């Protein structure tokens, strides 16, 4: 818990702990149909964990688009559903699996560490 | 809605309508492990839509069992979860997908018919 590390008046204590990765405490599916996507940016703004990334650009006559790609980083996504609800053209498919499949897909966290 | 069919004092109106099938308004997985199953009948009794069927029999020395098969009719199952909770030997695996996947797996009902 690291209380003693904080409490030690001489900073004599080191407490380490390895926590689980975020991806492993969460489960769901998410896909963005980039052809439907019109790159309004609203999902990128609203995503509270900054998992969505858009390759913005200034258009040119060779490339007359305001963006060239959009991606979701599933290492960060926690499947809150905000992006799919805000998308004006319903280009995002997103479903959280925690309640139906959480027992099987999310391993109970083992917290490791050492003291010195 | 057929109110006019009912209201017509001369029974002059025919109104038809084709409702969706029950299976298409509902989503889930369900399977029964027949080797674990002891054929106690509790799920068949509790199933509120009579979706579970047990092939009961009187035992004989050639066939010393009180039932030879058990089945779930998924055309009838609405994935309420009762059978799995009542099962004394946890022989039923059942998952309901309605809330997480209902947006994608359950098609919006569109009710057709005509008038005369
Ligand atoms: S000891 Fe292990 S536990 Fe007791 S405090 Fe220091 S850390 Fe938290
Ligand atoms: S919102 Fe729907 S549309 Fe606007 S960007 Fe994120 S995805 Fe492309
Ligand atoms: S889901 Fe909640 S989190 Fe995963 S991306 Fe769309 S928003 Fe960012
Ligand atoms: S008309 Fe079509 S709607 Fe108006 S009542 Fe007879 S049925 Fe219900
Ligand atoms: S309850 Fe568990 S056991 Fe008794 S029947 Fe339905 S399944 Fe086979
Ligand atoms: S789930 Fe609800 S419905 Fe489908 S079977 Fe077990 S009980 Fe009958
Ligand atoms: S809640 Fe969990 S269970 Fe009750 S319905 Fe929506 S999904 Fe099926
Ligand atoms: K300290
Ligand atoms: K953001
Ligand atoms: K029944």
Dihedral angle of Cα A36, A40, A41, A43, to the nearest 10 degrees: -60
**Nearest C-alpha neighbor of B38 from the set B3, B86, B96:** B86
Instruction: Give the CB-side neighbour count of residue A44, counting CA atoms within 13 A.
Output: 13
8 A C-beta contact, residue A70 and residue A112: no
Distance CA A102, CA A26 (A): 8
Measuring CA to CA, how many Å separate A69 from each of A12, A35, A38? 50, 10, 10
Strand ranges for chain A from DSSP E: 15-18, 28-32, 52-56, 67-72, 92-96, 112-115
C-alpha A77: how far from chain center: 2
Please provide the distance, in angstroms rounded to a whole number, between the alpha carbons at the two ends of chain A.
14
Q: Residue A7: what are its φ and ψ, rounded to 5°?
A: -75, -30
Instruction: Give the CB-side neighbour count of residue A115, counting CA atoms within 13 A.
Output: 8
| H or E element that contains B54 | strand B52-56
- Longest distance between any two alpha carbons in chain B, whole Å: 65
DSSP H helices, chain A, are 3-7, 42-46, 82-86, 98-105
Distance CA A65, CA A74 (A): 26
- Hey, which residues does B95 pair with through a beta bridge? B29
CB atoms under 10 Å from CB of B37, counted, come to 17
Label the pairing between strands A112-115 and A28-32: unpaired
Q: Pick the atom of ligand 6 nearest to B28's CA.
A: 4
Q: Determine the residue of chain A that is closest to B103 in CA distance.
A: A95
* Resolution, Å (one decimal): 2.5
Dihedral angle of Cα B2, B7, B11, B17, to the nearest 10 degrees: 0
Which residues hold their Cβ within 5 A of ligand 8, which is an ion? Answer: A 8, 11
Residue of the CA atom closest to atom 5 of ligand 3: A77
C-alpha A22: how far from chain center: 8
DSSP H helices, A8-115, are 42-46, 82-86, 98-105
Q: Which experimental technique did the depositors report for determining this structure?
A: X-ray
**Nearest 5 degrees, angle CA A91-CA A94-CA A100?**
160
Q: How far is A111 from chain B (nearest CA, A)?
A: 30
Distance CA B77, CA B92 (A): 13
8 A C-beta contact, residue A56 and residue A66: yes
């Amino acid at each position: 818990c690291k209380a003693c590390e904080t409490a030690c008046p001489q900073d004599a204590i080191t407490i380490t702990r390895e926590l689980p990765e975020r991806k492993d405490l969460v489960t769901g599916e998410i896909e963005i149909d980039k052809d439907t996507c019109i790159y309004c940016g609203m999902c990128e703004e609203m995503c509270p964990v900054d998992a969505i990334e858009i390759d913005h650009q200034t258009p040119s006559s060779a490339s007359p688009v305001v963006a060239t790609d959009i991606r979701v980083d599933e290492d960060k996504c926690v499947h809150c559903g905000i992006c799919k609800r805000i998308c004006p053209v319903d280009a995002i498919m997103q479903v959280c699996r925690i309640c139906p499949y959480g027992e099987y897909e999310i391993k109970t966290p083992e917290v490791t560490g050492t003291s010195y």
